[PDB]
C-alpha cells in the first residue's frame, strides 16, 4: 500500500500535453490560395467571361 | 484435536509460532524463495522493468502529418 501512494501523488500531478502545430501553413498557403482562385482569377475571369458576353452583345448585331 | 477447533489449534498455534517468526509466518525457506525469484521476474517479462515501487513518466510527441 505504500508502493501505491507514490504513484497517486506522482500520476493525479503527472498530465498529459494534445500534440502540437507543425503544418498549419496550410492555413496560410489556404489564404493565398484564396487570393488566386477568389480574387486574381475572379476578377481576371469577369473581365474574361466578358469579353466573350461583349462580343455577345456585339453578335445580337 | 477434535473438541474440533483443538485441530484448528492444533494448525493455529503452528501458525501463531510461524507468523510470530518473521517474514510474519516462513520456514517456507530459500527453496519457495528460487521460485518465488522466478515467477516474481518472469511477472516483470509480461508486464515492463521500471518503476514497481515509484510511479512511471512518460511523453508527448508527434512524427508528420503523412
Redesign the interface.
Known amino acids: 500500500a505504500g ?1 501505491v501512494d ?2 497517486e ?3 493525479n500531478a ?1 498530465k ?2 494534445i ?2 502545430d ?2 498549419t501553413a496550410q492555413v496560410d498557403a489556404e489564404e493565398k490560395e484564396d487570393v488566386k482562385s477568389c480574387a486574381e482569377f475572379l476578377t481576371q475571369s469577369k473581365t474574361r467571361i466578358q469579353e466573350y458576353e461583349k462580343e455577345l452583345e456585339k453578335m445580337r448585331n | 484435536l477434535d473438541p474440533v477447533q483443538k485441530l484448528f489449534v492444533d494448525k493455529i498455534r503452528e501458525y501463531r509460532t510461524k507468523r510470530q517468526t518473521s517474514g510474519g509466518p516462513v520456514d517456507a525457506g530459500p527453496e519457495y524463495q528460487q521460485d518465488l525469484d522466478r515467477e516474481l521476474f518472469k511477472l516483470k517479462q509480461m508486464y515492463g522493468k521500471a ?8 511523453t ?3 512524427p ?2 503523412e
Do not use: I
Not at chain 2, 51 to 58: E, I, Y
Open positions: 508502493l507514490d504513484f501523488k506522482k500520476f503527472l498529459v500535453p500534440p502540437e507543425k503544418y | 518503476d514497481m515501487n515509484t510511479f512511471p513518466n512518460f508527448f510527441e508527434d508528420k502529418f
